[PDB]
């Protein structure tokens, strides 16, 4: 019974619905559309700012939590990778603030925002490393608590940030929500005595670095595929139409992201450890089929329900100025069902750690997204983007099942 994990997931979702509502009421579709590319860079940083080794951290930590020698080597090497990547991340941010603003916003008017992120992304990397540490020690309480306080102080940080700074303040606030988690995490890691601070001194173990490097390569492939895909599609969509039109399509994604993460909580905690243990083919197919028999009707019931109250959903989580999303709801929710269905095939590849299959999965989604947007974005606009999102994951789900039965019969 992992009630700590569900509680922190609930608090995180409630805060996201909050700040998302405030961002939509204060800045309307133009704000939700313009901030969409910036919110993308944040999630990538949470995936990569600390070299993206955190899942490799919590794994090898549990492996060697009983060997004080090997436990110090894994944490000291992980702290070394976080520190070096964070410093390199600060340098590229301060040296390329204008080109990043260009690729993200279309204008270089956000130079100061990207440069300040160089300091903010350090709180991303260290906060994530401290949380991954508490995970590998089976400290679900200290992790969930640090996540609860961090999300609360985030909402506090977002309010004062947007009230003082306006729109850019709201953008900086969004950066402070996952960054300010360093303070509760550090307090919980140290005051609880789960590990002495001497273990965090940066050392280098050649072997453990290479294993965590494969985790870094995986997050790198994750970062330069689907994230840069969505950015180009919102830039092409804001070039033919308005940034207000971007906020119309981004709003339906923001609503669907509410229930999807509580659904994915039934994945990483229960699915991923299972597929890694079992080996036989017949055993693997049985676990993929049973997860599909759960998550596919689960996401379909939630999707159909938000479609049934799409008028209420827009009025509740966003503003009435977002009334034009009602017709994009149907097309996006079908793609959501198929994306979550293809999630079980991706979590199999993650368990296999096949960088070949992961590359193929992300490249296939990026390519399908690009071609379908180029055909539908200039014609139908924001609706054409939702039509794209569905049609890729129609082909993606179909293709994923085909390569599964091929790989099941030793292709």
């Amino acid at each position, epitope marked *: 019974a992992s009630l700590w994990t569900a509680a922190s997931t609930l608090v995180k979702i409630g805060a996201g619905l909050l700040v998302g509502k405030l961002l939509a009421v204060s800045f309307g579709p133009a704000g939700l559309g313009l901030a969409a590319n910036f919110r993308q860079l944040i999630t990538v940083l949470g995936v990569l700012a600390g070299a993206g080794i955190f899942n490799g951290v919590t794994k090898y930590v549990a492996q060697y939590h009983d060997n004080p020698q090997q436990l110090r080597r894994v944490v000291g090497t992980s702290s070394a990778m976080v520190l070096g990547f964070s410093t390199l991340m600060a340098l590229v941010f301060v040296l390329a603030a204008a080109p990043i603003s260009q690729g993200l916003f279309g204008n270089t008017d956000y130079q100061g925002l990207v440069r300040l992120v160089a300091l903010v992304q350090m709180g991303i990397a260290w906060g994530n490393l401290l949380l991954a540490l508490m995970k590998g020690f089976r400290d679900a309480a200290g992790n969930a608590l640090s996540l609860i306080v961090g999300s609360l102080i985030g909402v506090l940080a977002y309010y004062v940030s947007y009230r003082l700074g306006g729109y850019e303040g709201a953008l900086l606030g969004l950066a402070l929500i996952p960054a300010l988690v360093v303070i509760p995490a550090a307090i919980m890691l140290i005051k609880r005595g789960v590990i002495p601070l001497s273990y965090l001194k940066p050392s280098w173990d050649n072997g453990l670095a290479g294993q965590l490097s494969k985790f870094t390569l995986m997050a790198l492939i994750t970062s330069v595929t689907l994230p840069v895909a969505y950015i180009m599609m919102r830039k092409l969509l804001a070039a033919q*139409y308005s940034w*207000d*039109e971007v906020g119309i399509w981004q709003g339906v994604s923001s609503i669907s992201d509410a229930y999807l993460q509580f659904i994915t909580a039934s994945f990483s905690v229960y699915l991923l450890p299972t597929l890694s243990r079992l080996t036989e083919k017949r055993d693997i197919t049985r676990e993929v089929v049973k997860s599909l028999k759960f998550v596919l009707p689960a996401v379909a019931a939630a999707s159909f329900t938000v479609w049934l109250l799409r008028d209420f959903a827009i009025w509740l989580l966003l503003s009435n100025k977002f009334t*034009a999303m009602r017709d994009l709801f149907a097309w996006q929710l079908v793609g959501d069902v198929l994306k979550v269905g293809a999630y079980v095939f991706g979590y199999l590849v993650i368990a296999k750690a096949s960088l070949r299959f992961y590359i193929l999965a992300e490249v296939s989604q990026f390519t399908l997204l690009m071609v379908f947007a180029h055909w539908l974005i200039p014609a139908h*606009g924001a609706l054409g983007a939702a039509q794209a999102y569905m049609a890729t994951y129609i082909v993606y789900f179909s293709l994923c099942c085909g390569v599964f039965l091929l790989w099941r019969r030793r292709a």
Partner: nanobody
Amino acid sequence: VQLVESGGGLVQAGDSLTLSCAASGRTAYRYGMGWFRQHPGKEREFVASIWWTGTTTYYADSVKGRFTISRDDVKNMVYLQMNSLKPEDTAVYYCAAKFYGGNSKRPGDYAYWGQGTQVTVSS
């Protein structure tokens, strides 16, 4: 959906004028709208259009800065607020409708049309 025009007439140079285009009440909020004008014997050239969601508006170069196209959904009407009329604006103004449209310059990409209101501007 049926379109009817109103608000035209004779005006002097530099004054303002508001054009109105009433639409029938059936799924009119999913229809994209646009304004066209026509010289005596000449073609129907583009003035301004609104995207069917109401977020994007398109204007011609001879139009931008002076004319404003908007939409009132509770009254099922589309407006063209004119501000600094010039003798070159003298034409017959049509409003056109298109389902899931309203981002084309060509008149052929607009299925439904109105009867048109003539606006003459002098001096």
